[PDB]
């Protein structure tokens, strides 16, 4: 067979230990799910430094905690805007997930609170910026560089799926690089508890699995499809399916055809053909062997999964960091004010936040 006795015994024991870890992680998650934390700071505890990100989701600001001096990224949401855009459930669910999970590649929520106008999530500051910026700057990542990042996503999805959480928001725009060069996943607005199927149309055109496009009841295998898109884009510098307009992208996705740059290794192409598999009965991550079909694939043969989890692998790239509070890896924005109001807004809808 492909493995001798010693290698097969070692892999079997490793896979059993992952099961043991995940069972304990699930018990810990469910306890925190039932008893969420609440109102653990207030706005005057922080200095506002600079806007890090702005959009329909509200804004994220670099702040400094007055007492301790530590920097954080504070996501601010306007309650009245959340209501207008029909996002109450997604907002409450994102905060509930973040306060309940624990994994080295998932961003940590340190504080949350609200006031008359806004909701606040105070998260660890991840100073390296978005993978998107680095990928467009360098052009494409070499296969070892891409593999280092992909391994972290595989482990993170293995963790989330063991909690019965579907992720659905994977793309380079939504991955941050930390000071040690490792990945941080931050956005949980599309995440959902899904033990069987779910049906919502959500995501980004280039990263949509065919079964979402085709309006099916789908399952957590859409995340493994999206991992295929991510690995492809990291290694090529462009994604496998693109076009002027989303409709043409969807036509390519569902076609069952994908083409590769001539510099992709044969191992990489084989892995991608099994992730970008339109047939769910054949897609890696959705088979009897689960995540092990991915972890044991030849493209990952050099990957030490425990060492990645323990953050003991030297990262291929370390982002420039000229000290704490450095924001050079983020974009520049116009600093709109944080206006509070004398009248509470939307107290009923956000009572559990």
């Amino acid at each position: 067979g492909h493995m001798g006795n010693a290698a097969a015994a070692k892999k079997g024991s490793e896979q059993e230990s992952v099961k043991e870890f995940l069972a304990k992680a699930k018990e810990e998650f469910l306890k925190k799910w039932e008893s969420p934390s609440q109102n653990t700071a207030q706005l005057d505890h922080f200095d506002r430094i600079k806007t890090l990100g702005t959009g329909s989701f509200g804004r994220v600001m670099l702040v400094k905690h007055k007492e301790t001096g530590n920097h954080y990224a504070m996501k601010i949401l306007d309650k009245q805007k959340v209501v207008k855009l029909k996002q109450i459930e997604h907002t409450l669910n994102e905060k509930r997930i973040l306060q309940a999970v624990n994994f080295p590649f998932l961003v940590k929520l340190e504080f949350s609170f609200k006031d008359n106008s806004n909701l606040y999530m105070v998260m660890e500051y991840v100073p390296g910026g978005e993978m998107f910026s680095h990928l467009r700057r360098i052009g494409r990542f070499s296969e070892p560089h891409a593999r280092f990042y992909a391994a972290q996503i595989v482990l993170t999805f293995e963790y989330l799926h063991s909690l019965d959480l579907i992720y659905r928001d994977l793309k380079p725009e939504n991955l941050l690089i930390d000071q040690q060069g490792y990945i941080q996943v931050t956005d949980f607005g599309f995440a959902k508890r899904v033990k069987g199927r779910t049906w919502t149309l959500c995501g980004t055109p280039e990263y949509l699995a065919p079964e979402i496009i085709l309006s099916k009841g789908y399952n957590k295998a859409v995340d493994w499809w999206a991992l295929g898109v991510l690995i492809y884009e990291m290694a090529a510098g462009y994604p496998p399916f693109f076009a002027d307009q989303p409709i043409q992208i969807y036509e390519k996705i569902v076609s069952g055809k994908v083409r590769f740059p001539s510099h992709f290794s044969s191992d990489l192409k084989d892995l991608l053909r099994n992730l970008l598999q339109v047939d769910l009965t054949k897609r890696f991550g959705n088979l009897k062997n689960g995540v092990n079909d991915i972890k044991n694939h030849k493209w990952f043969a050099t990957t030490d999964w425990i060492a990645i989890y323990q953050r003991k692998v030297e990262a291929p790239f370390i982002p420039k960091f000229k000290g704490p509070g450095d924001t050079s890896n983020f974009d520049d924005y116009e600093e709109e004010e944080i206006r509070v109001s004398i009248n509470e807004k939307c107290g009923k809808e956000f009572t559990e936040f």
Partner: peptide
């Protein structure tokens, strides 16, 4: 090239969700 076609698509900056 395929890369040229990518640039020409225009979908080469940050991409919004649907």
């Amino acid at each position: 090239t395929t890369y040229a076609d990518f640039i020409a698509s225009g979908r080469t900056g940050r991409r919004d969700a649907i």
